[PDB]
Automatic annotation (TrEMBL):
Protein name per Swiss-Prot or TrEMBL: Probable porin
Keyword Signal: yes
Family classification: Belongs to the outer membrane porin (Opr) (TC 1.B.25) family.
A GO MF label: porin activity
Gene3D superfamilies per record: Porin
Length: 361
């Protein structure tokens, strides 16, 4: 049993919001207990993981759940059945709040052939700190489905160039095709251009119990890395009459212009991003990083014959991984969020998040 391990992930989360068309605060604490067995010896290996989740309001117990995950392994192929945290282009579980969003399902991954990863899965339920079954975020939770089917392939053509295709199907609600092209171009010592191009095509599926689904999503992130600096531009475009479909539960839309508050995927929205990163290591402060980014959106469809909405958001994050002493490896994050829109809400918000992972064995 020496290959087994246990960890406890701790998250302390404080947010001060000023939302209006009101200054309210929130302090809370997350625990994620991860138990992972090793694998039963032999060609076909067997294992068992357990994931325990607890959210506490700051103290009153707010949310708890315990899930198990059976795992099988053979050569380069793995099957997991039970609690899952998928991080896939058509289902990228949320983890920017207190606790990670989880799913129950079965996920098969296989990397038998050099440079090729194949994925096939089915998710049956979504769980968040807030009566299950899945639906498009923003639509009728009464017209839900217990079956999300996914299949994918990623191929590294060269170590500079890889491509990905994924298919997501929420049975009887929607279908989604994803195409991604990732190109990294070296440009001299400490220099590289990362081109991250993404395309989603979303339509209805089966009985279409939540109504029509019409969205194509074109988005790209170009990132110039230079020594300890990084400079990025993002462009994103919603086409069709619908917002970009994601699974309910604040699942993260896998998109270039995703921000701390808004996703910039509203119906017909066109947006661009500027982002700057700095690693302070060279300056003598390893573990300290600055990220600041700004996204501006327009042409947001408000229907009828109304004027389109428009919006902007700025995010500034200062993050610090403590390098030594009793709190070594404790991570701190200060996030400043500023958001304005023409016809909707305005927001100012500060968050302070402390993360730490304790190894139990």
């Amino acid at each position: 049993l020496a290959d087994s391990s246990a960890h406890l992930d701790l998250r302390n989360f404080y947010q001060l919001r000023d939302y209006r068309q009101s200054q309210a605060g929130n302090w809370s604490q997350g625990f994620v207990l991860r138990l992972q067995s090793g694998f039963t010896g032999g060609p076909l290996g067997f294992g068992l993981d357990a994931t325990g989740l607890l959210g506490v309001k700051l103290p009153v117990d707010d949310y708890s759940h315990l899930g198990l995950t059976a795992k099988l392994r053979y050569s380069q192929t793995q099957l997991q059945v039970g609690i899952l945290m998928p991080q896939l282009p058509v289902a990228f579980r949320d983890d920017v709040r207190l606790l990670p969003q989880t799913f129950d399902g079965a996920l098969l991954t296989s990397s038998e052939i050099e440079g090729l990863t194949l994925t096939a899965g089915q998710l049956w339920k979504s769980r968040t700190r807030e009566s299950d079954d899945m639906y498009i975020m923003g639509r009728d939770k009464a017209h839900a489905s217990d079956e999300f089917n996914l299949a994918g392939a990623t191929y590294a053509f060269t170590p500079r160039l890889s491509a990905s295709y994924y298919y997501g199907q929420l049975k009887d609600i929607y279908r989604q095709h994803y195409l991604g092209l990732l190109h990294t171009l070296p440009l001299g010592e400490g220099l590289s251009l990362r081109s991250d191009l993404r395309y989603f095509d979303s339509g209805e599926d089966g009985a279409a119990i939540s109504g029509p689904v019409d969205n194509r999503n074109l988005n790209a992130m170009l990132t110039l890395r230079a020594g300890a600096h990084a400079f990025g531009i993002g462009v994103q475009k919603m086409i069709g009459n619908d917002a970009f479909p994601v699974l309910n539960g604040y699942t993260t839309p896998y998109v270039a212009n995703l921000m701390a508050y808004q996703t910039f995927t509203r119906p017909q929205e066109k947006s661009w991003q500027l982002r700057y990163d700095y690693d302070f290591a060279g300056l003598g402060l390893p573990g300290l990083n600055l990220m600041t980014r700004y996204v501006q959106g327009r042409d947001i469809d408000r229907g009828a014959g109304r004027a389109d909405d428009s919006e902007w958001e700025r995010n500034t994050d200062l993050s610090y991984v403590i390098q030594s002493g009793p709190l070594k490896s404790v991570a701190l994050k200060w996030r400043n969020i500023t958001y304005r829109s023409r016809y909707g809400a305005d927001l100012d918000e500060n968050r302070f998040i402390v993360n730490y992972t304790l190894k139990l064995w």
